[PDB]
Design a protein around this motif. Structure first.
Motif, PDB file in Angstrom:
ATOM      1  N   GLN A  80       0.819  -1.209   0.000  1.00 56.83           N
ATOM      2  CA  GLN A  80       0.000   0.000   0.000  1.00 56.83           C
ATOM      3  C   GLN A  80       0.855   1.262   0.000  1.00 56.83           C
ATOM      4  O   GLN A  80       0.501   2.253  -0.649  1.00 56.83           O
ATOM      5  CB  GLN A  80      -0.954  -0.003   1.194  1.00 56.83           C
ATOM      6  CG  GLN A  80      -1.845  -1.228   1.261  1.00 56.83           C
ATOM      7  CD  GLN A  80      -3.063  -1.108   0.369  1.00 56.83           C
ATOM      8  OE1 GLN A  80      -3.450  -0.011  -0.030  1.00 56.83           O
ATOM      9  NE2 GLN A  80      -3.672  -2.242   0.045  1.00 56.83           N
ATOM     10  N   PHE A  81       1.973   1.246   0.726  1.00 60.22           N
ATOM     11  CA  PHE A  81       2.891   2.376   0.741  1.00 60.22           C
ATOM     12  C   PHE A  81       3.449   2.637  -0.648  1.00 60.22           C
ATOM     13  O   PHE A  81       3.494   3.785  -1.096  1.00 60.22           O
ATOM     14  CB  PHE A  81       4.022   2.116   1.735  1.00 60.22           C
ATOM     15  CG  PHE A  81       4.992   3.254   1.866  1.00 60.22           C
ATOM     16  CD1 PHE A  81       6.107   3.328   1.055  1.00 60.22           C
ATOM     17  CD2 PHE A  81       4.794   4.242   2.808  1.00 60.22           C
ATOM     18  CE1 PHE A  81       6.997   4.369   1.175  1.00 60.22           C
ATOM     19  CE2 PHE A  81       5.682   5.284   2.932  1.00 60.22           C
ATOM     20  CZ  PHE A  81       6.785   5.346   2.115  1.00 60.22           C
ATOM     21  N   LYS A  82       3.874   1.584  -1.350  1.00 59.72           N
ATOM     22  CA  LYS A  82       4.383   1.767  -2.703  1.00 59.72           C
ATOM     23  C   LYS A  82       3.304   2.327  -3.620  1.00 59.72           C
ATOM     24  O   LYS A  82       3.560   3.236  -4.418  1.00 59.72           O
ATOM     25  CB  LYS A  82       4.922   0.446  -3.250  1.00 59.72           C
ATOM     26  CG  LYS A  82       6.421   0.275  -3.091  1.00 59.72           C
ATOM     27  CD  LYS A  82       6.957  -0.804  -4.019  1.00 59.72           C
ATOM     28  CE  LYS A  82       6.359  -0.682  -5.412  1.00 59.72           C
ATOM     29  NZ  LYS A  82       7.030  -1.586  -6.383  1.00 59.72           N
ATOM     30  N   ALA A  83       2.081   1.799  -3.511  1.00 63.97           N
ATOM     31  CA  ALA A  83       0.997   2.274  -4.367  1.00 63.97           C
ATOM     32  C   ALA A  83       0.704   3.751  -4.122  1.00 63.97           C
ATOM     33  O   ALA A  83       0.650   4.551  -5.065  1.00 63.97           O
ATOM     34  CB  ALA A  83      -0.258   1.432  -4.139  1.00 63.97           C
ATOM     35  N   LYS A  84       0.526   4.133  -2.855  1.00 60.40           N
ATOM     36  CA  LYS A  84       0.206   5.521  -2.536  1.00 60.40           C
ATOM     37  C   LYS A  84       1.365   6.449  -2.865  1.00 60.40           C
ATOM     38  O   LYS A  84       1.155   7.605  -3.249  1.00 60.40           O
ATOM     39  CB  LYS A  84      -0.179   5.648  -1.063  1.00 60.40           C
ATOM     40  CG  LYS A  84      -1.586   5.176  -0.763  1.00 60.40           C
ATOM     41  CD  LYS A  84      -2.216   5.976   0.359  1.00 60.40           C
ATOM     42  CE  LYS A  84      -3.404   5.241   0.947  1.00 60.40           C
ATOM     43  NZ  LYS A  84      -4.500   5.072  -0.044  1.00 60.40           N
ATOM     44  N   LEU A  85       2.598   5.964  -2.720  1.00 60.56           N
ATOM     45  CA  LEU A  85       3.760   6.789  -3.011  1.00 60.56           C
ATOM     46  C   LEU A  85       3.874   7.042  -4.506  1.00 60.56           C
ATOM     47  O   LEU A  85       4.163   8.163  -4.936  1.00 60.56           O
ATOM     48  CB  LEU A  85       5.018   6.106  -2.471  1.00 60.56           C
ATOM     49  CG  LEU A  85       6.396   6.703  -2.745  1.00 60.56           C
ATOM     50  CD1 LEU A  85       6.377   8.178  -2.447  1.00 60.56           C
ATOM     51  CD2 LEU A  85       7.456   6.004  -1.917  1.00 60.56           C
ATOM     52  N   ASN A  86       3.632   6.013  -5.318  1.00 55.90           N
ATOM     53  CA  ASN A  86       3.683   6.185  -6.762  1.00 55.90           C
ATOM     54  C   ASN A  86       2.457   6.901  -7.310  1.00 55.90           C
ATOM     55  O   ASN A  86       2.502   7.383  -8.447  1.00 55.90           O
ATOM     56  CB  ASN A  86       3.837   4.826  -7.444  1.00 55.90           C
ATOM     57  CG  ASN A  86       5.131   4.707  -8.215  1.00 55.90           C
ATOM     58  OD1 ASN A  86       6.149   5.285  -7.836  1.00 55.90           O
ATOM     59  ND2 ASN A  86       5.101   3.955  -9.307  1.00 55.90           N
ATOM     60  N   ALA A  87       1.372   6.984  -6.540  1.00 62.33           N
ATOM     61  CA  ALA A  87       0.158   7.645  -6.997  1.00 62.33           C
ATOM     62  C   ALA A  87       0.124   9.140  -6.716  1.00 62.33           C
ATOM     63  O   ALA A  87      -0.822   9.808  -7.151  1.00 62.33           O
ATOM     64  CB  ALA A  87      -1.075   6.987  -6.361  1.00 62.33           C
ATOM     65  N   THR A  88       1.113   9.685  -6.011  1.00 66.56           N
ATOM     66  CA  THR A  88       1.111  11.102  -5.663  1.00 66.56           C
ATOM     67  C   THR A  88       1.936  11.885  -6.678  1.00 66.56           C
ATOM     68  O   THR A  88       3.108  11.571  -6.910  1.00 66.56           O
ATOM     69  CB  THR A  88       1.661  11.308  -4.254  1.00 66.56           C
ATOM     70  OG1 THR A  88       0.656  10.967  -3.291  1.00 66.56           O
ATOM     71  CG2 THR A  88       2.065  12.755  -4.051  1.00 66.56           C
ATOM     72  N   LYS A  89       1.326  12.904  -7.279  1.00 68.89           N
ATOM     73  CA  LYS A  89       2.024  13.724  -8.258  1.00 68.89           C
ATOM     74  C   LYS A  89       3.133  14.522  -7.580  1.00 68.89           C
ATOM     75  O   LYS A  89       3.039  14.879  -6.403  1.00 68.89           O
ATOM     76  CB  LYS A  89       1.035  14.662  -8.956  1.00 68.89           C
ATOM     77  CG  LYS A  89       1.647  15.585 -10.002  1.00 68.89           C
ATOM     78  CD  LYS A  89       0.628  16.578 -10.548  1.00 68.89           C
ATOM     79  CE  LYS A  89      -0.381  16.991  -9.488  1.00 68.89           C
ATOM     80  NZ  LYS A  89      -1.086  18.251  -9.852  1.00 68.89           N
ATOM     81  N   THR A  90       4.197  14.804  -8.334  1.00 75.99           N
ATOM     82  CA  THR A  90       5.329  15.534  -7.775  1.00 75.99           C
ATOM     83  C   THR A  90       5.054  17.032  -7.761  1.00 75.99           C
ATOM     84  O   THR A  90       5.885  17.830  -8.205  1.00 75.99           O
ATOM     85  CB  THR A  90       6.605  15.250  -8.567  1.00 75.99           C
ATOM     86  OG1 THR A  90       6.707  16.179  -9.652  1.00 75.99           O
ATOM     87  CG2 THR A  90       6.579  13.838  -9.124  1.00 75.99           C
ATOM     88  N   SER A  91       3.883  17.416  -7.244  1.00 81.20           N
ATOM     89  CA  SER A  91       3.592  18.822  -6.985  1.00 81.20           C
ATOM     90  C   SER A  91       2.873  18.987  -5.653  1.00 81.20           C
ATOM     91  O   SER A  91       2.589  20.121  -5.252  1.00 81.20           O
ATOM     92  CB  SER A  91       2.755  19.431  -8.114  1.00 81.20           C
ATOM     93  OG  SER A  91       3.563  19.721  -9.242  1.00 81.20           O
ATOM     94  N   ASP A  92       2.560  17.888  -4.970  1.00 85.77           N
ATOM     95  CA  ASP A  92       2.103  17.927  -3.594  1.00 85.77           C
ATOM     96  C   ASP A  92       3.237  17.633  -2.624  1.00 85.77           C
ATOM     97  O   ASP A  92       3.010  17.621  -1.410  1.00 85.77           O
ATOM     98  CB  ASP A  92       0.956  16.925  -3.384  1.00 85.77           C
ATOM     99  CG  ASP A  92       0.208  17.151  -2.085  1.00 85.77           C
ATOM    100  OD1 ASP A  92       0.315  18.259  -1.518  1.00 85.77           O
ATOM    101  OD2 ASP A  92      -0.491  16.219  -1.633  1.00 85.77           O
ATOM    102  N   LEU A  93       4.449  17.403  -3.126  1.00 87.41           N
ATOM    103  CA  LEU A  93       5.617  17.174  -2.283  1.00 87.41           C
ATOM    104  C   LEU A  93       6.527  18.396  -2.294  1.00 87.41           C
ATOM    105  O   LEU A  93       6.849  18.932  -1.232  1.00 87.41           O
ATOM    106  CB  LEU A  93       6.370  15.929  -2.749  1.00 87.41           C
ATOM    107  CG  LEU A  93       5.624  14.601  -2.719  1.00 87.41           C
ATOM    108  CD1 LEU A  93       6.488  13.558  -3.376  1.00 87.41           C
ATOM    109  CD2 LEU A  93       5.276  14.199  -1.303  1.00 87.41           C
ATOM    110  N   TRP A  94       6.954  18.855  -3.469  1.00 82.69           N
ATOM    111  CA  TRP A  94       7.826  20.020  -3.586  1.00 82.69           C
ATOM    112  C   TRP A  94       7.333  20.905  -4.721  1.00 82.69           C
ATOM    113  O   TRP A  94       7.503  20.568  -5.896  1.00 82.69           O
ATOM    114  CB  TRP A  94       9.278  19.608  -3.818  1.00 82.69           C
ATOM    115  CG  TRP A  94      10.249  20.516  -3.140  1.00 82.69           C
ATOM    116  CD1 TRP A  94      11.154  21.337  -3.737  1.00 82.69           C
ATOM    117  CD2 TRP A  94      10.413  20.697  -1.730  1.00 82.69           C
ATOM    118  NE1 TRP A  94      11.869  22.023  -2.788  1.00 82.69           N
ATOM    119  CE2 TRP A  94      11.433  21.644  -1.547  1.00 82.69           C
ATOM    120  CE3 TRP A  94       9.795  20.149  -0.606  1.00 82.69           C
ATOM    121  CZ2 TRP A  94      11.849  22.056  -0.289  1.00 82.69           C
ATOM    122  CZ3 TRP A  94      10.210  20.558   0.642  1.00 82.69           C
ATOM    123  CH2 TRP A  94      11.226  21.501   0.791  1.00 82.69           C
TER     124      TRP A  94
END
Lengths: 115, 115, 115, 115, 115, 115, 115, 115, 115, 115
Positions: free
Chosen positions: J62-76
């Protein structure tokens, strides 16, 4: 010979050859004395006896001869360098910056930049 | 001679030649005094006696002569440099950054970049 | 002279010449006082007496004359530089980074990059 | 004058000239006070008396005049630089990195790269 | 004035001019207070009184005027820079790396690379 | 063998092969002694016994043979470098500058600059 | 006001202007509180009261207005930079590397490389 | 198995697979032992048992196979690098220079220089 | 609310807006809790309560909205940068290397190289 | 669950989602355990329980799925970088070199070199 005597050679000559060879290969002093001359350490000043035997004319001449007679491929050849860097990498006592630098240099040497 | 006397030469002259030769070869002071003049250390101030004998006009002149008479191939020739760097590599008391740098320089010298 | 007196020269003049020569050759102060003026140290403030004799007009003038009269080949000539770097290399009290750097510079100087 | 008084000049005027000359030559404060004004240190706050005499209008004007009247060849000329670097080289209290750097700079200056 | 009072000027006005001039020349605070206002230190918080007198509108205006009225040749002219670097060179309390760097910069400035 | 004896080989020969292989793979000394020779540590000087067995002619010859017989792809291949850097990244004992540098180098290697 | 109260303005308004002006000129907090609000420090948590008064909407708006209304020549003009570097040079508490760097930068600024 | 036994495999085989997988993913040793083999730590020397199980021929072969069978996109892919740098940024235990450098590298990677 | 409860919003909503605004302006956590929620610190684990309120979905959404709604000229505009560097310059607690670097950067920014 | 049990999921599933989301957003471990699983810390070894729950196959997937599902604009995204650097600037606990570097980088980013 628990004293500090330079010239007592030609009686113990086979022991002086082992010392000369082990030193010319590159390993440090101090211990080689423990190896070849037993536990005669701390007799007086250990450094005094060590550098007293390090100053024999017989020593100096034979050491120079054996040192100049060794080809520069029994001291540093590529595979030994790889092994030494790998030793430094896999030792868990080398701190972490040194391990990182060793990985960097192993990377640089064997063209291993993802290729 | 347990005092601090500069001019007492021409009586002990063979001992002064061993000291001059060992010093001109490059080994440090302090110990060479232990080697050639026994355990007369801590008589008074050891540094005082050492630099008092280090200031003899006879000393200075003979030291300069012997130093200028030695060709620059009995002090530093390539094979001695390789041996010194190898000594520093194989000594497990040299810390780890120094060992890494010694490996780097042995690498740089003998064109051993994977070749 | 256990006091701090600048002008007492022309009575002790041969001692002042030895001090001037030893200082102009480059060795440090403090000890040269021990050498030429015995163990008169810690009489009062040793630094006070030392820099009091370091401020004589006679001193200053003769020191300047002798310093300007020495050619720049009795202070630093190549062979002395090689000997000093070698001294620093073979001294086992110099820490290990300094020894590595000394080996590097001896390498750079005498074109000894495997040639 | 065991107090902290700026204006008491024109009575002790020859002492103020020695202080001005020794300071303009470049040696540090604090000690020059010991030299010229005896052991009046620790009377009150020594730094207070020192910088109180360091603030005299007579001082400031004469110091500026003598400082601007000295040619820039009695302060730093090449031979003095060589002597200072050599002093730093032959002093066994300078740590080892500083000695190495001093050897480097003496090397760089007098074109002594094996030539 | 053992209190912390900003506005008490026009009564002690000559003392404020000495403080302003000594500060505008560049010497640090804290001590200048000892110099001009005696030993009133540690009355309460010394820093409190110091920066309380450092905040007078009269102070600020006169300090700005005198600071802007001084030409940039009574603050830093070449000969003062040479003297300051020489002071740092001849002070035996400056550690050894700083002395080496000061020698380097005196070398760089006055084109004294063996010429 | 609780003594320090170099030549006792040809009786314990299978144990010497495990030691040679584990050492040639690159893992450090000291522990490999614990692994193959049990808990005979601290018998006398542990380093003495270790480097005494490290100096056997049989050892040296077989170690050199096995070291030169291993291809340079069982020591450092790209995937092992990636794994070692990742180990250093995910270990919460490596300090933080080393982890940052490991991330930097993993970034540099696998062209992962946002691509 | 020995409590921690943000909104108590319009009663003490002249004191808030002195604080705003002293802060906008650039001097640090903490002390300015000692200056304008007496010795009310250590009432409770001093930092708590300080940053509580640092968060007034009246404060924020007036501080922003006064900060944006000051031309960038009452904050940093060349002569103030020269004075600050000179202050750092003549302070005998700044360590020695910082003094050397300050001399370097004063050298770089006013084209004072022997000219 | 509270002893230090290399070959006891084929009885506990499912536990060895979890260890191999967790290690090949990159997490450190020591703890993985706590995870899979319970609290058998400090039985004797914990490092001894750990590196004893780290030396099984079965281990070595399966570890090499699984390590070479994993594609280089389950170890380091861009999004994991972003997450690791962000973890280092938002952890208030990483000191402050490391956080600054992490912000710098996150800046460099995702072309976020104000664009 | 002396417990650690995430969802208790919509009852205390005006306090959450002050916290969000003060945080979005950039001031640190920990203290803002002291400011807006009184002295409820050290109730249990203060960091626990702080990061528990730092994890509210209401918090996160409103914080993101207010953070994205602020133009990049109320956070960093040139005049604020000048004021911050000046604050660091005039604070006598910043060590001396940092003050020197701040002077350097103020020099670089406002083209104040003697012009 | 005060034990160290990997597989106990599908009973507590909503708690595992909060943990996965908070971790994937980037905040550190250890505390998130305090947040979601109360004060069960120091039950046995806290790190043991933490990395035991960090090793669930359900977790990992689940961690891998949610991590790969987040666009790189909600992190930086740029505005978050500005806010983080500003946080580091206005925190009076970050030492002074880090604050200077943060000011430097905020300067470099938003083209704020006096423009």
């Amino acid at each position: 010979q628990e004293f500090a005597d330079p010239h007592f050679a030609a009686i113990n000559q086979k022991r002086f050859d082992l010392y000369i060879d082990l030193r010319v290969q590159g390993y440090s002093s101090w211990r080689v004395f423990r190896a070849i001359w037993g536990e005669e350490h701390m007799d007086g000043p250990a450094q005094a006896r060590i550098f007293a035997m390090e100053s024999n004319p017989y020593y100096r001449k034979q050491f120079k001869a054996k040192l100049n007679a060794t080809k520069t491929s029994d001291l540093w050849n590529p595979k030994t360098a790889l092994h030494e860097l790998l030793q430094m990498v896999r030792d868990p006592t080398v701190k972490d910056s040194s391990r990182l630098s060793a990985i960097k240099e192993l990377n640089v040497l064997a063209e291993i930049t993802f290729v």
